[PDB]
Design a protein around this ligand. Sequence first.
Ligand SMILES: O[C@@H]1[C@@H](O)[C@H](O[C@@H]2[C@@H](O)[C@H](O)OC[C@H]2O)OC[C@H]1O
Length: 398
Amino acid sequence: TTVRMMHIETDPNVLGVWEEIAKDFEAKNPDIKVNLEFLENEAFKAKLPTLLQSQQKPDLFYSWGGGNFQVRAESGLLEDMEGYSATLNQELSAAGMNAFKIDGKQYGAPYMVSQVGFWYNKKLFKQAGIDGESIQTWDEFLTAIEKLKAAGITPIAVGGADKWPMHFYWSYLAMRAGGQEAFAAAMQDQGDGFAGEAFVRAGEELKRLAALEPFQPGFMAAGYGESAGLFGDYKAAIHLMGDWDYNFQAQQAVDKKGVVDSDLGFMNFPVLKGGAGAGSDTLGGINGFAFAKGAKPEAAKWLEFFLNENSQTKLAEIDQIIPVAKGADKGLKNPFKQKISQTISSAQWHQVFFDQALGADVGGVVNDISVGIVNGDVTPKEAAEQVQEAWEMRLEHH
Ligand SMILES: O[C@@H]1[C@@H](O)[C@H](O[C@@H]2[C@@H](O)[C@H](O)OC[C@H]2O)OC[C@H]1O
């Protein structure tokens, strides 16, 4: 039998490890072949809707959980693999398995957890006269931005063309302004919801950052790959990105090394004055693979092995993922990844990426108003009302 797994992975080292695991699995299981199918992130997300309606579908596809996963599970687009999940449940974290379980039905399995934060270049910070470790508040972050501006260094790389990198700013600002309580009320559409003060404040503070002109020339035409390459090429000082950026900025750098460890820093998103959120709250998520309707049981056998402790330990040791398999945290030797993994574990609020939490429609609105605020197209108040209004209609029509 042949199992097909659709993914968005571009890293050659990661893919080599995945192929090694596949080869090992195939030796232990001669009856089963594993075929990996790549689709680039933006194209993948765009095509999945029609793919899930087709008659030829992969067994497994990359998933962020969140809003689209829920709708797909309830709408009959995924396959319940609860009867083939005993070993997955033994090997993987229960919180990770629960993220892909709806109504007692197991529709996927976790692969990794992540944190979004500020990767930064200590060599460029020294040139501008900034101590990165002293940045604890948003006002201190803006002061650092102005010092980079005055030094003639591009402060921030962002892939504005893809929009979601910019949304990380609006999202974190809303988390810091309103805390978990505000987001929970907004999801329930209680009170003013997403049009509430926390979300307007997020827009106001994003507008304040944008007025400093901190992004690279042409950031609205730049995708994630170009933006990470600018960081890796020492041409931008700061990159707000998930922890997967550690290997990506190196792969996208001309020299294939990027910002080396002695020049590299990572810092949490700062706190906001007059904000209800805690500095230890993380934006990130639990990514995994979902089972499309019609998936064969052999796909669960593959996933059992692909996500086991040895496989996940390898992927942590090449500094790619923060693992979900029990015991694979032994592979978090790299100091950047070890510290990030501890932040994720200690977080009282760990929030899934807003665009994935809210689904393709409302999440697309959040992505649009993030770049819209920065470009002056929409005010912070108008942008928050757009999110609330789209969310209210999603609630009504489901
Ligand atoms: O919608 C965003 C996703 O597209 C993005 O996906 C990243 C992917 O770019 C990277 O290569 O692997 C991690 C994966 O999560 O995540 C953030 C979302 O906001």
